[PDB]
């Protein structure tokens, strides 16, 4: 029937516990004991962290523990590490051989720490310009969370053409990392004063600056 | 050559209430007559004699008049199955096989569907009586502080009640049929092309084509009988709150009523599905060895 | 055992892809789950062989197919009428047991396959023009300036970009690359190398594009 129902964002200490739910209906959830987990880590495959409900498969620690009471099946993290950080799933068995998954619940632990971002800003380069082109070229690196928003000012004047941000992306040192460009003309790049590209992280707004 | 095809069963289009030939053809009167014990015990509304005598007696004769009027649909494929599933049979005749297998889809299906749309006044009363449970549970003193004492009798109760179901061994019966029926895919496989015998593999194909049926049938009420089973174990040994709230005791019986009468609505069929997976397993044993 | 899908793929729109799913007695059922950027997983369908019955969810009437080989034990799931909302992940997971897992079938608590991801796009395979974005001397960040160069305008994914011929790796930080909106890519690599090496180290960036059968050395040089 139905996708399943699940909070898109779990938060839990390191030490403590953390729970998610997963709501649906009497034909899937509710209607058979065949509900399973699954955490996921993105670009590899799925790993089964709970069968039947309630069963542990082979390996998985026993600090993993579902359950379910009608039709909101809940799985419990106890003792979270920092392994724990990924997308977890829930899924369960349906009328006429159909088979039903979550909307997923991102779980994230709260043991980092909180840095601002350090933004670089590259102006257009000689080759570029040579070919009726421009792109401010603005790198976003070292924040934690990822969650950046990038603003261009066109001298003091808000600018929202050309503009073409990333999603943010963690790195190896598991900070984030995130950039921005911003297409131009010869002849925009040569009439203003200087171009800015403000980075807002956590209330805190980190702003460099460019000029012909 | 079965003479019983008791195992068809329809779902509605929104997969929520279930129809069978056999009485009492719904999973939610055996809830109905669950209920008229849930009012038996508080005062408040223990006039339980108008619900059992007009409403629900009415439901049952209404659903078991309305399967009547599809007994000629009934009766057209029980012969059309005679004489497909037997070689003998079917050739005494001489229509296709091709031509037989598009008619029983066909036929089946206007009787299956002639169970659901004769009944889409019973579905409706059957929500009629889901609103008048919750609007006659209303009536009780209780409200923030109900309580729960009749519900944990009853939980007592369901205990017994499925120990005397064997699901240990509609366990162990199931997976000895699927294992005897795909080893009998597999042989017709490997000598439908080393024997020239068509109108009786054919017919043995014909069997097993309502074989893999049954057993989708019969797996799902042994899926919805554990969880009867394994939801109510938990209750007993879960939380046992003395108070709760109206609206939630409305919610603690419409749950167990839901699983007990999906148990014995399961126990029903089962017992059902038991000689009708034999049955057709009998007809594989003789026309296997009347293929050697 | 273990599952094996084939490689990535890159179609276009409105066209037809299959993908594979090789295994290691072929009685469980072998199902197909995808995930879309920002999304979550989505069964879609399953495969008795032994029964020969296929099923398939409701979103996906007659889009998918899914046929089986029981010569060589592969499950095919092929893809028709195909939209730039069908790139995703596609993963084949088969159930645990053998018809004999109770009564959860499909049921996906089994091995799953390591992935196959397919992109559908309607860009054509472009090679980069790739800029040397020249060190800038005024803002030497304490003596570590920064220089990079700016891959603009390529596809498909992904790039290859090293620096001194894979010699220099201190500094180096290429970041993920940009979806334009005209469908192609575009990213960056940045090498924090010493102030007073800029004007004596020569530094090459080497970005290869296979698909295109690209390779593009750009010097980046201080601004004069």
């Known amino acids: 029937q139905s996708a399943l129902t699940q909070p898109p964002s779990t938060s839990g200490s390191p030490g403590q516990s953390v729970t998610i739910s997963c709501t649906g209906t009497g034909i899937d959830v509710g209607g058979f004991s065949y509900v399973s987990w699954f955490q996921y880590h993105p670009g590899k495959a799925p790993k089964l962290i709970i069968f039947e409900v309630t069963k542990r498969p082979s390996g998985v620690p026993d600090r993993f523990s579902g359950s379910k009471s009608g039709n909101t099946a809940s799985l419990t993290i106890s003792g979270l590490q920092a392994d724990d950080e990924a997308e977890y799933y829930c899924s369960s068995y349906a009328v006429n051989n159909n088979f039903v998954f979550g909307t997923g619940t991102k779980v994230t632990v709260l043991v980092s720490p909180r840095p601002t971002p350090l933004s670089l800003c590259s102006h257009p380069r000689s080759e570029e310009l040579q070919a009726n082109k421009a792109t401010l070229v603005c790198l976003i690196s070292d924040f934690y969370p990822g969650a950046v928003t990038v603003a261009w000012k066109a001298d003091s004047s808000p600018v929202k053409a050309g503009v073409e941000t990333t999603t943010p992306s963690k790195q190896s040192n598991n900070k984030y990392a995130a950039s921005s460009y911003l297409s131009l003309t010869p002849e925009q790049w040569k009439s203003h004063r200087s171009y800015s590209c403000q980075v807002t992280h956590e209330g805190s707004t980190v702003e460099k600056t460019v000029a012909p | 050559t079965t003479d019983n095809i008791d195992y068809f069963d329809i779902s509605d289009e929104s997969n929520y209430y279930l129809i069978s030939q056999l009485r009492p053809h719904f999973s939610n009167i055996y809830f109905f007559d669950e209920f008229k014990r849930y009012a038996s015990y508080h005062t408040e509304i223990k006039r339980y004699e108008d619900i059992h005598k007009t409403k629900v007696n009415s439901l049952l004769n209404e659903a078991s008049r309305a399967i009547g009027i599809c007994n000629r649909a009934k009766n057209t494929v029980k012969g059309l199955i005679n004489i497909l599933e037997n070689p003998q049979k079917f050739k005494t005749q001489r229509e296709s096989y091709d031509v037989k297998l598009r008619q029983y889809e066909e036929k089946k299906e206007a009787f299956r569907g002639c169970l659901l749309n004769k009944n889409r006044k019973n579905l409706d009363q059957i929500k009629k009586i889901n609103n008048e449970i919750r609007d006659l549970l209303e009536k009780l003193k209780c409200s923030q502080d109900c309580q729960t004492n009749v519900y944990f009798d009853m939980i007592k109760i369901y205990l017994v009640d499925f120990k005397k179901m064997p699901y240990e061994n509609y366990d162990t019966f199931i997976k000895q049929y699927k294992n005897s029926y795909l080893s009998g895919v597999d042989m017709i496989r490997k000598i439908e092309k080393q024997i020239d015998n068509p109108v009786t593999i054919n017919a043995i194909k014909f069997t097993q084509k309502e074989m893999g049926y049954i057993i989708d049938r019969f797996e799902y009420h042994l899926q919805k009988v554990k969880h009867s089973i394994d939801q109510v174990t938990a209750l007993s040994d879960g939380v046992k709150p003395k108070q709760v709230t109206k609206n939630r005791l409305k919610e603690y019986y419409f749950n167990i009523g839901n699983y007990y009468s999906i148990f014995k609505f399961g126990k029903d069929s089962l017992n059902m599905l038991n000689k009708a997976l034999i049955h057709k397993e009998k007809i594989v044993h003789n026309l296997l060895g009347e293929l050697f | 055992v273990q599952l094996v899908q084939s490689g990535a793929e890159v179609k276009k729109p409105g066209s037809s892809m299959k993908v594979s799913c090789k295994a290691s007695?072929?009685?469980?059922?072998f199902s197909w789950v995808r995930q879309a950027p920002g999304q979550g997983l989505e069964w879609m369908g399953g495969?008795?062989?032994?029964?020969?019955?296929?099923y398939y969810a409701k979103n996906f009437k007659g889009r998918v197919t899914i046929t089986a080989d029981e010569s060589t034990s592969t499950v095919y799931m092929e893809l028709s009428s195909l939209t730039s909302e069908d790139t995703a992940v596609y993963f084949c997971?088969?159930?645990?047991?053998?018809?004999?897992?109770?009564?959860?079938?499909?049921?996906?608590?089994?091995?799953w396959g390591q992935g196959t991801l397919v992109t559908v796009s309607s860009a054509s395979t472009k090679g980069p023009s790739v800029f040397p974005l020249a060190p800038s001397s005024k803002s030497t960040s304490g003596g570590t300036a920064a220089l990079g160069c700016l891959v603009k305008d390529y596809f498909p994914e992904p790039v290859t970009v090293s620096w001194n011929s894979g010699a220099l790796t201190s500094g180096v930080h290429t970041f993920p690359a940009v979806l334009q909106s005209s469908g192609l890519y575009s990213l960056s690599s940045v090498v924090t190398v010493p102030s007073s090496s800029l004007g004596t180290q020569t530094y090459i960036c080497n970005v290869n594009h296979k698909p295109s059968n690209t390779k593009v050395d750009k010097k980046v040089e201080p601004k004069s």
């Open positions: 495969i008795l062989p032994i029964l020969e019955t296929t």
């Open positions: 997971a088969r159930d645990e047991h053998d018809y004999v897992w109770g009564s959860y079938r499909p049921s996906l608590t089994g091995p």
């Open positions: 007695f072929n009685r469980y059922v």
